[PDB]
């Protein structure tokens, strides 16, 4: 009943030995793609979401006994590839000698001796941060080491790269690894589901998932949230902060309304949905509308709270998948090739599940929630006494920032990767806690005892090579130069 092209992806991966639940739902993949989905969504076919509840509106706690049913779980398939770096993300070292995985296994640590000793934490991880993973909590977090493959790992699944011009199979006789690929954190349910996970977690008990990036810090376990969602009753929870100038380029959330036909179970029916708009799904005529911060005021901070029970219920509803818009993104079998076969790579975003429930919600929440670690420059900020340590393990900013992070703005063909960072801040890392922003133009080095306040530039004239500031130096609202 399949297209042959469709037969070829199937025989594929039955053969390399894919789970089923993922083959489903590549599959329904593959047939979209097949009829020629766009992907689309015209401005027409969404409203804006004018108001939201507010984290710092809310005040109630959920009693231990929810944390008990709740499982974590952080996105850990990420290299710190576009840092020049090849191991997993959440290894690397964000404050004194601690890494991202170190503070959400802190966290939980110290959830579970003070408040549930059952939180669940799971970590989302690939091909490429298994290993890596395994051997760190081996040998830092050995309670977590000894259930590793039973409840914490979770491997994220890998599907075929197909062909543009035929939808089958790419091959690349050269490195056949490349003729597969992730298919996007959307696969995130499909992995839960597949696995057996999913229907285990919830024969256990476990009513709450929250979900969140590895790299994110901001991100961790607000007994709030899951008041309210016990309280209004919501199957899922979308995390969103207000967009600025700076994000309008990323997604937003938007309304829809939706007609379903129903037959044999339930009459028709006219629901209003929530959705998630990226830019590839924004046809250029709207492309203006799309960066309207002000009618699409809200974007995904991908901080979800999902009830798994519910969670499991609707996939089975949908013959055990999870039916999440595909993404279809263009690309060439070797990206280290433009002449290599063009192919699809089918993908899905997590956060398009808000779509897929009655009982969806977003809340708005504070930019503090949202502080992904994408560049060194972030990692500058992250380092310094910008940041301090809560009893319970968290990273935020020290009282004297006023909530307001330092801007650091570093200058890349030097920071851009841990390479040339690591330089910078070889002899120390600056005080910022007291800096507005700081900007780092070509080759320099932080002396050490160094402290910044308000503005401060530091460039190097035309590259004279290595521009090391003084010790003990403190820079304040100036252009240091040589």
């Not at 219920?313 to 279809?328: D, F, N």
Request: with cysteine; aromatic share 8%.
């Amino acid at each position: 009943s399949l297209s042959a092209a469709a037969q070829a992806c199937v025989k594929k991966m039955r053969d390399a030995k894919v789970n089923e639940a993922c083959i489903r739902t590549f599959i329904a993949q593959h047939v979209m793609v097949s009829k020629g989905e766009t992907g689309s969504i015209p401005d027409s076919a969404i409203m804006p979401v004018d108001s939201l509840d507010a984290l710092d509106s809310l005040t109630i706690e959920c009693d231990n006994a929810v944390l008990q049913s709740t499982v974590v779980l952080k996105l850990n398939g990420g290299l710190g590839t576009g840092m020049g770096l090849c191991d997993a993300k959440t290894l690397l070292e964000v404050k004194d000698g601690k890494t991202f995985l170190d503070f959400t296994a802190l966290q939980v640590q110290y959830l579970r001796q003070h408040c549930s000793e059952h939180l669940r934490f799971m970590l989302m991880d690939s091909f490429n941060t298994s290993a890596s993973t395994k051997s760190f909590l081996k040998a830092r977090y050995p309670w977590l080491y000894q259930v590793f493959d039973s409840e914490v790992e979770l491997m994220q699944n890998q599907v075929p790269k197909i062909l543009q011009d035929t939808l089958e199979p790419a091959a690349w006789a050269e490195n056949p690894a490349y003729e597969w690929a992730p298919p996007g954190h959307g696969d995130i349910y499909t992995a839960l589901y597949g696995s057996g996970k999913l229907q285990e977690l919830v024969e256990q008990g476990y009513r709450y998932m929250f979900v969140s990036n590895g790299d994110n810090l901001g991100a961790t376990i607000d007994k709030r949230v899951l008041a309210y969602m016990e309280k209004e009753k919501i199957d899922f929870l979308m995390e969103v902060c207000r967009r600025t100038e700076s994000d309008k380029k990323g997604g937003h959330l938007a309304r829809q309304t939706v007609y379903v036909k129903g037959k044999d179970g339930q009459p028709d029916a006219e629901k209003r949905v929530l959705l998630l708009r990226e830019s590839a799904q924004c046809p250029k005529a709207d492309m203006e509308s799309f960066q309207d911060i002000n009618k699409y005021s809200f974007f995904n901070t991908n901080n979800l709270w999902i009830r798994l029970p519910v969670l499991l219920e609707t996939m089975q509803e949908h013959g055990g998948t999870l039916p999440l818009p595909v993404i279809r993104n263009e690309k060439t079998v070797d990206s280290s090739n433009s002449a290599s076969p063009k192919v699809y790579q089918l993908e899905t975003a997590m956060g398009a599940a808000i779509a897929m429930f009655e009982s969806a919600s977003a809340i708005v929440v504070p930019r503090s929630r949202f502080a992904p670690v994408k560049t060194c420059a972030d990692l500058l900020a992250l380092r310094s006494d910008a940041y301090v340590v809560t009893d319970d393990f968290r990273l935020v900013l020290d009282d004297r920032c006023h909530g307001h992070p330092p801007v650091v703005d570093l200058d890349s063909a030097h920071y851009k990767m841990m390479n040339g960072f690591e330089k910078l801040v070889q002899h120390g890392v600056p005080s910022l806690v007291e800096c507005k922003r700081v900007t780092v133009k070509g080759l320099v080095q932080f002396g050490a005892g160094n402290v910044l306040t308000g503005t401060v530039t530091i460039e190097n004239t035309d590259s004279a090579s290595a521009f090391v500031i003084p010790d003990g130096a403190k820079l304040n609202d100036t252009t240091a130069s040589p």
